[PDB]
CSV table of C-alpha atoms in Angstrom, one decimal:
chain,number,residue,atom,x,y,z
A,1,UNK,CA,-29.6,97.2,17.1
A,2,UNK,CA,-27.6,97.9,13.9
A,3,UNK,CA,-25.3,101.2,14.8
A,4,UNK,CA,-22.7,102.8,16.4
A,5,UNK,CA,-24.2,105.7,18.0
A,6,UNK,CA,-25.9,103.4,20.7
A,7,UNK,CA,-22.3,102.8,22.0
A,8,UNK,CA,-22.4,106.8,22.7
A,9,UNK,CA,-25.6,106.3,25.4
A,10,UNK,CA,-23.3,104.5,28.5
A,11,UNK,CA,-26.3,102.9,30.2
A,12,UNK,CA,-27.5,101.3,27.5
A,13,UNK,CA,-24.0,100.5,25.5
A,14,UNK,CA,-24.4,96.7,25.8
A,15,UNK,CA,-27.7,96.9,23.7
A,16,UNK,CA,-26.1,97.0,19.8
A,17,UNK,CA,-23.7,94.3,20.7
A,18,UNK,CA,-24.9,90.8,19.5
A,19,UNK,CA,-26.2,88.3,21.7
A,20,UNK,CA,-23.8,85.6,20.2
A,21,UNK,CA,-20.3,87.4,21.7
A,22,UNK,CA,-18.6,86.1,25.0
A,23,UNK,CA,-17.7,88.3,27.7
A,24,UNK,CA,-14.8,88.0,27.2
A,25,UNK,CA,-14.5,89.2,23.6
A,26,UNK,CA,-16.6,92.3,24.8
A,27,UNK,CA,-14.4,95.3,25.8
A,28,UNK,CA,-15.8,96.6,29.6
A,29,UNK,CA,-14.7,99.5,31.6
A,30,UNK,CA,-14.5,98.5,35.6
A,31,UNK,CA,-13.9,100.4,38.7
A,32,UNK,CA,-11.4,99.2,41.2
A,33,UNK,CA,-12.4,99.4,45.0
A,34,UNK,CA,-16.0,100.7,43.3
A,35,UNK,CA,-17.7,101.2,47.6
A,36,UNK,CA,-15.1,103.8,48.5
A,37,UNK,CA,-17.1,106.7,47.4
A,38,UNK,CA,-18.6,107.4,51.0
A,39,UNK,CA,-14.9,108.2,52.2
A,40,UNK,CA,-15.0,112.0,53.7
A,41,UNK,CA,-12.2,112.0,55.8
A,42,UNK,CA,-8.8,113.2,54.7
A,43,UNK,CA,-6.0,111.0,56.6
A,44,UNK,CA,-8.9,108.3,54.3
A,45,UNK,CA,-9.2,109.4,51.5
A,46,UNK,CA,-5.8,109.7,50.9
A,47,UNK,CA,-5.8,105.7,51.4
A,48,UNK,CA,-8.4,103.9,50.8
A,49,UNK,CA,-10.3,106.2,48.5
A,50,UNK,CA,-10.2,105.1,44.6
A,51,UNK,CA,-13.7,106.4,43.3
A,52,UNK,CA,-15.8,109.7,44.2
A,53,UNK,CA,-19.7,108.8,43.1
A,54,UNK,CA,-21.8,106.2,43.7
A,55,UNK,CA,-22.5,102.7,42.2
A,56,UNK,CA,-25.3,104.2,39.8
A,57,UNK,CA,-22.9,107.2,38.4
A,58,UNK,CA,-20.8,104.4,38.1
A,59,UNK,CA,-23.0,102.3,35.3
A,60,UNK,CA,-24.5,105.6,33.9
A,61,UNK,CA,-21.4,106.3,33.1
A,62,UNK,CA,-20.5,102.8,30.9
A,63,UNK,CA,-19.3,101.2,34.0
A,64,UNK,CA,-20.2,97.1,34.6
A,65,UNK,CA,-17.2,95.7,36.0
A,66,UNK,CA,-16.8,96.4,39.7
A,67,UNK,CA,-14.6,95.1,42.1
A,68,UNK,CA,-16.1,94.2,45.2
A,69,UNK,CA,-14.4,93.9,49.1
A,70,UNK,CA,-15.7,92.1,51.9
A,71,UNK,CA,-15.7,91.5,55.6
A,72,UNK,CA,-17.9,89.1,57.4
A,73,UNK,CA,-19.7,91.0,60.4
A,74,UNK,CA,-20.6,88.8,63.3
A,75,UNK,CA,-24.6,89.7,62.2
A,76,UNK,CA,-23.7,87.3,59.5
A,77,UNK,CA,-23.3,90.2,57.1
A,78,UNK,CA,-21.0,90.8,54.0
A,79,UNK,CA,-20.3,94.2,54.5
A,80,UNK,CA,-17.8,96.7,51.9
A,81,UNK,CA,-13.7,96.8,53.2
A,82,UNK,CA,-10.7,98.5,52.1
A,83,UNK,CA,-8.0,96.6,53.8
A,84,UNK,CA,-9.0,97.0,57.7
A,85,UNK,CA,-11.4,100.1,56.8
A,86,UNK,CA,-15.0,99.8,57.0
A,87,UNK,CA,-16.2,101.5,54.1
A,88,UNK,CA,-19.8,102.3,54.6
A,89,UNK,CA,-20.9,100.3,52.3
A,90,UNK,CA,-22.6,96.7,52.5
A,91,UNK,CA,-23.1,94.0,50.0
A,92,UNK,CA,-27.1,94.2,50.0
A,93,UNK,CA,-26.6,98.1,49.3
A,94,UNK,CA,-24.4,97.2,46.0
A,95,UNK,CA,-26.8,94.2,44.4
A,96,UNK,CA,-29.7,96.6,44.9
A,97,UNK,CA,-28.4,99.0,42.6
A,98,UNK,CA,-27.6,96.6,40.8
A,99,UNK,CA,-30.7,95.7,40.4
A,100,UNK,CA,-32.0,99.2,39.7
A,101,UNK,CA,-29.6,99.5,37.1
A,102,UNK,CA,-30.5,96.2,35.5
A,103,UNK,CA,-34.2,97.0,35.5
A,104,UNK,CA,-34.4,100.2,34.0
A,105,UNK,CA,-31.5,99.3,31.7
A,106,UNK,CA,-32.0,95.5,31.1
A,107,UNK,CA,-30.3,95.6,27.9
A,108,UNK,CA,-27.1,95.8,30.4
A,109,UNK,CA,-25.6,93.3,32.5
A,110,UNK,CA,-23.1,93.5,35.4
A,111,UNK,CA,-19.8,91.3,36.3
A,112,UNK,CA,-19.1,91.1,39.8
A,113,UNK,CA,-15.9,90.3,41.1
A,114,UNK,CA,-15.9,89.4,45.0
A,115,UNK,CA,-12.8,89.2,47.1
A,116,UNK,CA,-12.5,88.7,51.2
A,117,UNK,CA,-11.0,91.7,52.0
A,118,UNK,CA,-10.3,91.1,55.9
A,119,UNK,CA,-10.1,88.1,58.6
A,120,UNK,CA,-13.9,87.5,59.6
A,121,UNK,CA,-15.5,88.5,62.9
A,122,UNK,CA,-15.5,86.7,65.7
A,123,UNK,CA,-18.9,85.6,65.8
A,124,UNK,CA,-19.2,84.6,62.2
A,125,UNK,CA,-21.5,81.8,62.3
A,126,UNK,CA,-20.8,80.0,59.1
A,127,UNK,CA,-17.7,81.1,56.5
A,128,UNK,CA,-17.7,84.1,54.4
A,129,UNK,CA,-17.9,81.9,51.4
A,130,UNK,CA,-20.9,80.1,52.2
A,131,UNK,CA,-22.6,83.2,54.1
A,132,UNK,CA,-22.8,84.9,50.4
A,133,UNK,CA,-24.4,82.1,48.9
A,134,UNK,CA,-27.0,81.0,51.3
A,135,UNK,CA,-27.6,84.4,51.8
A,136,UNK,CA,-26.9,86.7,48.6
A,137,UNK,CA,-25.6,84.4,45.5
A,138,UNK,CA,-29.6,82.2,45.7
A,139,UNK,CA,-31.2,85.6,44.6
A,140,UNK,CA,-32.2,85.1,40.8
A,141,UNK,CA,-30.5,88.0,39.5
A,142,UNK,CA,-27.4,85.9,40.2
A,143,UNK,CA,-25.9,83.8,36.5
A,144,UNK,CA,-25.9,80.5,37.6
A,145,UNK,CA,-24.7,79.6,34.2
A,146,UNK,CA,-21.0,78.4,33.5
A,147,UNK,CA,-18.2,78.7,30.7
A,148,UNK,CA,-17.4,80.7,27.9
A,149,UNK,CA,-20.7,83.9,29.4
A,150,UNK,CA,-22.3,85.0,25.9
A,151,UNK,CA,-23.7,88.5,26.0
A,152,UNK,CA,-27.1,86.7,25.3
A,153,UNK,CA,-27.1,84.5,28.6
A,154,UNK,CA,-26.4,87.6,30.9
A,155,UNK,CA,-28.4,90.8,29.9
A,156,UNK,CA,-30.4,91.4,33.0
A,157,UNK,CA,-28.9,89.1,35.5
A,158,UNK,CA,-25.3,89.6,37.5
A,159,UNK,CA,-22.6,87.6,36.0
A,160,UNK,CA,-20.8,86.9,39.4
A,161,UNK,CA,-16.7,86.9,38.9
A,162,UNK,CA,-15.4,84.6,41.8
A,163,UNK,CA,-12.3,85.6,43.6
A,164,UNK,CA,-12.6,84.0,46.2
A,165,UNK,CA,-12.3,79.8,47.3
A,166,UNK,CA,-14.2,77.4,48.6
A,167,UNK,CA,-17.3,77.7,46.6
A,168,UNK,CA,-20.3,75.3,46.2
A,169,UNK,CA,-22.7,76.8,43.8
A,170,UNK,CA,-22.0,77.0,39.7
A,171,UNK,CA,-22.4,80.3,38.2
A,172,UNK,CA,-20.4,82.5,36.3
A,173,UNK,CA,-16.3,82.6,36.4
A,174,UNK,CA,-14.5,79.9,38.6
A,175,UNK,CA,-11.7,81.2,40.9
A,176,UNK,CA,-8.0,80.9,39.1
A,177,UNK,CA,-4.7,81.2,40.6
A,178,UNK,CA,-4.1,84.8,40.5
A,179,UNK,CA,-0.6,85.8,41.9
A,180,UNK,CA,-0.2,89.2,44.0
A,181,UNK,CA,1.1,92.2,42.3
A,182,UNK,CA,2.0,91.3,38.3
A,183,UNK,CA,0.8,90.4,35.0
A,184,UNK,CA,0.5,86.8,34.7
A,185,UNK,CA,-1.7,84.1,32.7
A,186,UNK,CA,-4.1,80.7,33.6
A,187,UNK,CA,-6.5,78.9,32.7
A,188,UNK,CA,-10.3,79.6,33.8
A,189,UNK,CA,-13.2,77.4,33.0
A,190,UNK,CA,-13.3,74.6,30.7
A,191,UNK,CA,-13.2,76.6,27.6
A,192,UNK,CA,-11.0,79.7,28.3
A,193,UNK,CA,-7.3,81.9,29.2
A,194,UNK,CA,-7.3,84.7,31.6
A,195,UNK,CA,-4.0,87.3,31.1
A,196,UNK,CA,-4.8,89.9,34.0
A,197,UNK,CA,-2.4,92.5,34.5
A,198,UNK,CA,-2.7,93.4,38.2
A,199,UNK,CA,0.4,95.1,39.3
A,200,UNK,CA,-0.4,97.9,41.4
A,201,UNK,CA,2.4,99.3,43.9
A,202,UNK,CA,4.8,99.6,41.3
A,203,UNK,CA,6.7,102.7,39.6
A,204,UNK,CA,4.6,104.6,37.4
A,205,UNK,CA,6.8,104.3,34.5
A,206,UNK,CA,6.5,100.7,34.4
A,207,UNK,CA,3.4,100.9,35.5
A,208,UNK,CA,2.3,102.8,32.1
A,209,UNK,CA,4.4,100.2,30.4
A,210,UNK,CA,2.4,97.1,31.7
A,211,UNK,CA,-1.0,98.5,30.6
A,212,UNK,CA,0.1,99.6,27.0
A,213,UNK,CA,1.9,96.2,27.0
A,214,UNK,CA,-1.0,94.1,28.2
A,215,UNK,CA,-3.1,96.0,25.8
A,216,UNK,CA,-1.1,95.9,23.1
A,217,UNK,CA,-1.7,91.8,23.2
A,218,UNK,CA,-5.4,91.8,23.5
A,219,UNK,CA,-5.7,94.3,20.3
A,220,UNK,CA,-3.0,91.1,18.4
A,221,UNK,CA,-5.2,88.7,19.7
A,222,UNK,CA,-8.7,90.3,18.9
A,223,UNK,CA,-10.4,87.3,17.6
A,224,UNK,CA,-9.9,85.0,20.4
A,225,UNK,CA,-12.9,84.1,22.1
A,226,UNK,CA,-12.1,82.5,24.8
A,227,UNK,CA,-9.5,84.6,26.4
A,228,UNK,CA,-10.4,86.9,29.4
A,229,UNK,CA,-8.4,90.0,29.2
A,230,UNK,CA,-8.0,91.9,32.5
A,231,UNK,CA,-6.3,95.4,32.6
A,232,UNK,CA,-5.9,96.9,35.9
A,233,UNK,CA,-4.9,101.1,35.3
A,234,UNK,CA,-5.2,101.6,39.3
A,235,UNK,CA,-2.1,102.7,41.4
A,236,UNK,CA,-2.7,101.9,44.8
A,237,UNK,CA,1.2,102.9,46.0
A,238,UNK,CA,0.1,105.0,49.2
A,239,UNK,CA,2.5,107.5,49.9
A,240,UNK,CA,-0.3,109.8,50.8
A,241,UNK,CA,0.4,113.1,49.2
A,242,UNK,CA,0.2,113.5,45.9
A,243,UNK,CA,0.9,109.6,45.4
A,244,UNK,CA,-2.6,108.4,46.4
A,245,UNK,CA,-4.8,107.0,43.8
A,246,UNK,CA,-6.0,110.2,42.6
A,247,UNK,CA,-2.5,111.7,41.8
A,248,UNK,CA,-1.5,108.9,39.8
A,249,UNK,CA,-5.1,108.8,38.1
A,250,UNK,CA,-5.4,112.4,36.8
A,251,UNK,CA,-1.9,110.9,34.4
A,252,UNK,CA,-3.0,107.5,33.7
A,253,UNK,CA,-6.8,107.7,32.7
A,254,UNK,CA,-6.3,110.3,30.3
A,255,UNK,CA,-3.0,108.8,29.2
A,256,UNK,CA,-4.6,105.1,28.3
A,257,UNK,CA,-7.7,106.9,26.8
A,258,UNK,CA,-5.4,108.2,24.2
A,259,UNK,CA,-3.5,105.0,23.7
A,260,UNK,CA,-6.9,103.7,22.8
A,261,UNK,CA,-8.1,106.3,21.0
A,262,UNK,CA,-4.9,106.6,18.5
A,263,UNK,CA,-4.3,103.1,18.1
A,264,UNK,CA,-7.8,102.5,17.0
A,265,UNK,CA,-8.0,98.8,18.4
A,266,UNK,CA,-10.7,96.4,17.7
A,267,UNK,CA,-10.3,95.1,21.1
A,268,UNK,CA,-8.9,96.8,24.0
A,269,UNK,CA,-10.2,94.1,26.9
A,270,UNK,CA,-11.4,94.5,30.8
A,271,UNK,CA,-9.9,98.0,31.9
A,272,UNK,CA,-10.7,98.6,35.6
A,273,UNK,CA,-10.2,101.8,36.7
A,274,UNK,CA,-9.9,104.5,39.6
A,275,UNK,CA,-11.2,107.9,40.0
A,276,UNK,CA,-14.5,107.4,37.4
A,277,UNK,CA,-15.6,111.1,36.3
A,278,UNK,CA,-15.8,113.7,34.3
A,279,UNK,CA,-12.9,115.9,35.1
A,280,UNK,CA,-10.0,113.5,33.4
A,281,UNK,CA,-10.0,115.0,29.7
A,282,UNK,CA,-9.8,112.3,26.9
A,283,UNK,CA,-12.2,109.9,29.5
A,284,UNK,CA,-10.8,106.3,29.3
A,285,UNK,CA,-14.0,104.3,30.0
A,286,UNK,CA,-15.7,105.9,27.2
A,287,UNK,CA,-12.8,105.0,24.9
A,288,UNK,CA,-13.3,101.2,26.1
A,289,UNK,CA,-16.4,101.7,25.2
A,290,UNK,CA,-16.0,102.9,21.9
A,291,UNK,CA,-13.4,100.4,21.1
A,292,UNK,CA,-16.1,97.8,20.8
A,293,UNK,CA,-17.5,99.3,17.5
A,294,UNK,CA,-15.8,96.5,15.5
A,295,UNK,CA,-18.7,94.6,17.1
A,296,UNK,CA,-21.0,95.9,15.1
């Protein structure tokens, strides 16, 4: 409604904020690789691994951006990959939480991003592309809606973030360019600007750098509407000890959450994430969260 404690209850913090404001505008925490929870094995983990709990811990804990990897199985499935891994995870598993989520929390909506993750199987009848959406993308939970996404046009439904080409249905955010490891900017829609600052594989000093950086712009340029603002804090650089995902997160997350939380922005943009929990001490997510009181 009319408060700022209802941004302090994560599965329901996209109640108080106004059906009028675009996506966009909206300040959302993500998870990066969000279907490598089920990874138990070491010589894995170590690699692949970016998140520890589930989907639903994931959005009861604020979460509703989540980036999605796919393979197509030769049973015409779109199935959950980290590079060549098979995560044990499938696409069907993910949009029925989803669902879940959205039903007993409807004042919520999720953002989808989908991305082939590996060379298709052999007996792939059709394309990945159009396997999802004859098969998945029809369902009605699915945004078929276009643009500049208000908040109002997406509470309940899955606002689908394409990232991958070749696609024949309308709904949600149309694939742009999207270079491979940087911060760069492009055009979306008809109406919008996307600044994503994907650079993972880098240093962690500049690393740091680029997310205060890229930050720093969206909190300038608070009032612009139609300018997507993606903020990647993940570190994929393997390494494997003490250099995996998990190293790097345990400085990062609590280092951005006090960026935010100092600087008092009115906008602080997409931040996706690894390692969502409780154990990081200043908890970034929430902060992103937080950060959206202006909205209210």
């Amino acid at each position: 409604a009319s408060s700022v404690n209802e941004l302090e209850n994560w599965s329901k913090w996209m109640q108080p904020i106004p059906d009028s404001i675009p996506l966009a505008r909206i300040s959302i925490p993500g998870t990066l690789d969000s279907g490598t929870f089920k990874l138990q094995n070491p010589i894995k983990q170590v690699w692949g691994m970016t998140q520890e709990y589930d989907f639903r811990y994931q959005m009861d804990h604020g979460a509703r951006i989540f980036d999605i990897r796919g393979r197509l199985t030769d049973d015409n499935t779109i199935v959950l990959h980290h590079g060549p891994l098979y995560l044990y995870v499938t696409l069907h598993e993910f949009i029925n939480e989803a669902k879940q989520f959205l039903k007993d929390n409807p004042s919520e909506t999720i953002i989808m991003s989908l991305k082939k993750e590996y060379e298709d199987m052999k007996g792939a009848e059709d394309s990945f592309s159009s396997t999802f959406e004859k098969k998945y993308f029809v369902d009605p939970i699915f945004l078929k809606t276009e643009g500049n996404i208000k908040l109002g046009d997406a509470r309940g439904k899955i606002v689908l973030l394409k990232r991958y080409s070749g696609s024949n249905e309308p709904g949600g955010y149309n694939n742009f360019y999207w270079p491979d490891n940087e911060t760069f900017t492009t055009t979306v829609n008809q109406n919008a600007n996307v600044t994503v600052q994907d650079k993972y594989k880098v240093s962690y000093d500049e690393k740091v750098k680029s997310i205060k950086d890229t930050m720093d712009e969206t909190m300038n340029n608070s009032e612009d509407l139609n300018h997507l603002y993606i903020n990647f804090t993940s570190l994929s650089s393997g390494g494997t000890a003490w250099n995996s995902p998990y190293y790097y997160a345990s400085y990062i997350n609590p280092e951005i959450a006090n960026y935010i939380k100092q600087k008092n922005p009115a906008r602080v943009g997409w931040v996706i994430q690894d390692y969502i929990n409780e154990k990081w001490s200043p908890l970034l997510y929430q902060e992103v969260i937080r950060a959206n009181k202006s909205l209210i």
